[PDB]
Symmetry: C2
Subunit: 65 residues, 2 copies
Amino acid sequence: DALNVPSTCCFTFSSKKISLQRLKSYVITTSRCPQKAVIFRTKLGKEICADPKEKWVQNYMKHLG
Amino acid sequence: DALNVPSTCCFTFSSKKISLQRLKSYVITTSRCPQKAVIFRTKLGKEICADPKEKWVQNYMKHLG
């Protein structure tokens, strides 16, 4: 027996294209989420939901690695 | 246009009944999540997923409020 903890999912995608300079990293949401999403983490710690299909999101993922 | 941020959901429920003394508060997950869950927040800041069908879970919610 163990404690289990929550998962992070995106159900809406950001409509603002944030400056790439604010960003530290990205992750793709757990496969358990109903929809695939990118979560960007900013250098100040904010998490931003973004649509994996959008050109800007893809370009940012390429820059971030 | 605005940034949007992630949601917190539970996909598995804790099997350990945690001590009530460890707990600070609870919330029910957003209706955007694909299943209903309780998240307990411990006094030290940990978030724990729990099944609202379970008797102890409902008892704990009563005590916390």
